[PDB]
Structure 1
Amino acid sequence: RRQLIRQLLERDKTPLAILFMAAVVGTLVGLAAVAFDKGVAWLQNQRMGALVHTADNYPLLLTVAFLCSAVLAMFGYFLVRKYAPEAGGSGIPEIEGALEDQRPVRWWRVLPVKFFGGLGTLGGGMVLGRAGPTVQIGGNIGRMVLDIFRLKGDEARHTLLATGAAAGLAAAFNAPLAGILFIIEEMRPQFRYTLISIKAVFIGVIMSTIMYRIFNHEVALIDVGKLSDAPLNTLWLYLILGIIFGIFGPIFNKWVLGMQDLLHRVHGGNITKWVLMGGAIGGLCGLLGFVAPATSGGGFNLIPIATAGNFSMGMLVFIFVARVITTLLCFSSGAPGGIFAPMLALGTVLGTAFGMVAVELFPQYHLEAGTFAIAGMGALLAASIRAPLTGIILVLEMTDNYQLILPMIITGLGATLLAQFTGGKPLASAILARTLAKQEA
């Protein structure tokens, strides 16, 4: 008690030094995120144009696509294996590690690797997001400033590493709330207190978001329009859908993990059979980007189209299966790139389909399939990485259908609920667990 009183009166006083530094961090992460984001676009572009000039005939071009993505894949798989192996896959597991002080931040290596790395895997049209990359790139930026300014302390090492990963997510999805929420719900050391300063993370998020806005305003990443509302007599349906995502979250967790192992064999850890295999997956993606594009790519492309109930039943299920596959390959293959976006895409597609069925089971509800899409869009994020608060808010800032806030809060929650009563676990933590264990062994 007597101590507490002493603390209360002392609460919320973050050293201006950390504060001013939080600003620069975000600013950097922002610009960087912008820079990443422009690069990827550029590469998807040339792949487009080089098919234009070789429009024929089937094969001349089914192949130039394959190569282009294969050749970009390999550049990426190589850049990781050779100079920064810890910059493979997501980036989140890693940085979560760093927040525990159970991994290091080799920023002078990771920056170039991930960035020019992802530039390749992303740009070549692989099933993988910007999120991992930029969240990772983000902490490293935050680290690089700690180093350059000889900042020392736990708080300061913890906070600056923290803000760059928030401001890295912020600038990735243009979601400044979800940026902050992620740190305080997931990223952070999960089992003990931490000296992360909220006030600082905000500032970073702000500044990187602004940077994103200075170069991407005048277009949302996802347009969905304002969907219909949701009658109270309609809510149980959102619980059901949550329950499905609740069983499937863990199952998809198994496969992501398992598929990592079953993919380690095809090179046994060997930099050459890896870069060549990744080169093959990459090639597969740049092919699919042209013969079935909904199955390949990041998949933001198909959220709008799914939400508008534009796919038939068949095309939805196909896309879902097809993506369950390609997502596994691209992520489990250790290639640098997040699984966050492609999960949004799975949740969306799943959502719609679930909707479609309800629409015709109950014309009395005047349902629109599209509201189940938006409920499900974050539901996978909720069942598999288990950080629902962050997914719910991620979709919120991203779709602006605030009136669906109950259905979305319910679907998400009923996913995190069955994902716990089927024994799944935070896929981000299952991955950090994997790393740390195959290390003291």
Structure 2
Amino acid sequence: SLHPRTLVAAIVVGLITGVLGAGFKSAVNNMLQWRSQLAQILAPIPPLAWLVTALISGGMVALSFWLMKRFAPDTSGSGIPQIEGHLEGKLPLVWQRVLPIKLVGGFLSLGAGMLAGFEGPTIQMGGSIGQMTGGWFKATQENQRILIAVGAGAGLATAFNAPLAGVALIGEEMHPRFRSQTLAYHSLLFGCVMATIILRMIRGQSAIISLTEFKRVPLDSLWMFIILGILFGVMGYTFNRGLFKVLDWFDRLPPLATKWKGFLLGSIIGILSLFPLPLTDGGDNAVLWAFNSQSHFSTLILVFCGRFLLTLICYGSGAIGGIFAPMLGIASIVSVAMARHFHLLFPSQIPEPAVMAIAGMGALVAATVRAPLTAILLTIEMTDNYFVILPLLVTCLVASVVAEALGGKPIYTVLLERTLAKQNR
């Protein structure tokens, strides 16, 4: 029941966000390693670098907070809420403000080593482009919502080289109307495909962490992932609660504290960037650290607590963030620790314990977001592994059920109610 003019528009949307998302990630990574190489040049003598890396990080983050307001406080935090809202009625979206501020601002935040969060910027920048090209194409009212949704989806696909995930995002979480043109699915797929094709031409083509050869997953091992789900259930519950309490604390000023909040917060992160441990940055490193670098079980617990708190502090401060990746890093660290433990206890049912690490990789996301279907897809797409689906399905949706059984609520719908409460920012 689809319509051409809108499909070609999607081709354009996904194409643009693809180029941007890819270049954005590349840009952020360049800045990340540049600050890492600067710390080593000065490393020899002595903690001089301690001061230098502290300034650069603190300065960037502060400069980022400034570029936020005044200019577009709308770009604060994730991006799912702002687009989920606009797409629904409440809250506006103006690309001329979001696009440049989210980009330049997001670059400063992430590049400084903040605990975010590529999908943050790339998802809002996606929606912006979707809208910006919606006008260029003189799209109808409904069609423009679609184009914005496509951008949002393409945004996620670009951050993780995960087409299906981006598509599922709009579908499950952020369920929009589309009336009656529900065949915005085509627009989505189109937008996502292009985005990743460009994403792969620029930095592709491989996945984030391909673990394709772990395929032995016995059926009488499933009971385990129920427990693993129960675990990520309460974990997601406290993560949400904690986030909100840290969100309040940061809302409570004082006017002076806020002025320094930008610099102080960014300078500590800069210090923690130096230690040889993945307790900063987006979370990709954290995942690429759980697997594969074998490290002391204690160090796992150590880095888990560090990141779990630090992400709360980082996102809680309201910096240009993005919470997806950080929860992937936290989960993958926990799932590895749990993988080891269960292999310890029932090796005959967990021959390859990597299976479990993979299963719980998207479990935290499913619990905190109420979006198991997308969390499942996400991990599949970023491990090229479908063999782990049964454990995946069980752990992810049991984590989701247990979370909203303790009454946790979708982190994004709450994050929206709050950003709405700022109808006087």
**AA of the residue aligned to 2:291:** T
The structural deviation recorded for 1:111 is 0.6
The structural deviation recorded for 1:231 is 0.8
Q: 1:183 aligned to 167, 170, 180, which one?
A: 170
Q: In the alignment, which residue of structure 2 is the partner of 1:9?
A: none
Moved more, 320-329 or 142-151: 142-151
Q: In the alignment, which residue of structure 1 is the partner of 2:225?
A: 238
Residue 108, structure 1, aligned to residue 96, structure 2: yes
Distance 2:126 2:417 in 1: 22
The structural deviation recorded for 1:366 is 4.7
The structural deviation recorded for 1:140 is 0.5
Matches within 5 A, 1:277-316: 277-308=261-292, 310-316=294-300
Name the SS of the counterpart of 2:70 in structure 1. Answer: helix
- What are the superposed Cα offsets for residues 330-356 of structure 1, whole Å, 9 maximum, x if unpaired? 111100010100100111111111111
The structural deviation recorded for 1:23 is 1.0
Distance 1:149 1:341 in 2: 33
Matches within 5 A, 1:13-28: 14-28=2-16
Distance 2:137 2:412 in 1: 31
Matches within 5 A, 1:303-342: 303-308=287-292, 310-342=294-326
Residue 54, structure 1, aligned to residue 42, structure 2: yes
Residue 167, structure 1, aligned to residue 151, structure 2: no
Q: 1:74 aligned to 58, 62, 79, which one?
A: 62
Distance 1:44 1:256 in 2: 26
The structural deviation recorded for 1:276 is 2.4
**AA of the residue aligned to 1:280:** L
Change (3 A) 1:382 1:145: same
Residue 433, structure 1, aligned to residue 421, structure 2: no
Distance 2:350 2:147 in 1: 49
**AA of the residue aligned to 2:176:** P
Distance 1:262 1:359 in 2: 41
**TM-score of the superposition, structure 2-length normalised?**
0.95
Q: 1:374 aligned to 337, 358, 361, which one?
A: 358
Q: In the alignment, which residue of structure 1 is the partner of 2:250?
A: 263
Matches within 5 A, 1:74-153: 74-153=62-141
The structural deviation recorded for 1:236 is 0.4
Q: Check conservation: 2:36, 2:274, Cα contact below 8 A.
A: no
**AA of the residue aligned to 1:310:** Q
The structural deviation recorded for 1:96 is 0.2
**TM-score of the superposition, structure 1-length normalised?**
0.92
**AA of the residue aligned to 1:229:** R
The structural deviation recorded for 1:367 is 3.3
**AA of the residue aligned to 2:332:** T
**AA of the residue aligned to 1:393:** L
Distance 1:366 1:29 in 2: 41
> Structure 2: which 5+ runs fail to align?
none
Q: Check conservation: 1:44, 1:125, Cα contact below 8 A.
A: yes
Change (3 A) 1:218 1:281: same
Distance 2:288 2:110 in 1: 20
**What number of residue pairs does the alignment pair up?**
424
**AA of the residue aligned to 1:370:** A
Q: Check conservation: 1:29, 1:137, Cα contact below 8 A.
A: yes
Residue 347, structure 1, aligned to residue 334, structure 2: no
RMSD: 1.9
- What are the superposed Cα offsets for residues 120-172 of structure 1, whole Å, 9 maximum, x if unpaired? 1111111101002101110011111122333232x212101110000111111
Q: Check conservation: 2:279, 2:286, Cα contact below 8 A.
A: no
Q: Check conservation: 2:87, 2:145, Cα contact below 8 A.
A: yes
- What are the superposed Cα offsets for residues 72-99 of structure 1, whole Å, 9 maximum, x if unpaired? 1112111112200010110110000011
The structural deviation recorded for 1:440 is 8.5
The structural deviation recorded for 1:309 is 6.9
Q: Check conservation: 1:77, 1:274, Cα contact below 8 A.
A: no
The structural deviation recorded for 1:222 is 2.3
Q: 2:395 aligned to 375, 391, 411, which one?
A: 411
Sequence identity, in percent? Answer: 39
The structural deviation recorded for 1:188 is 2.6
Moved more, 276-285 or 16-25: 276-285
> Structure 1: which 5+ runs fail to align?
1-11
- What are the superposed Cα offsets for residues 39-72 of structure 1, whole Å, 9 maximum, x if unpaired? 1012113212222321233411122111111111
Q: In the alignment, which residue of structure 2 is the partner of 1:40?
A: 28
Name the SS of the counterpart of 2:217 in structure 1. Answer: coil
Q: Check conservation: 1:378, 1:391, Cα contact below 8 A.
A: yes
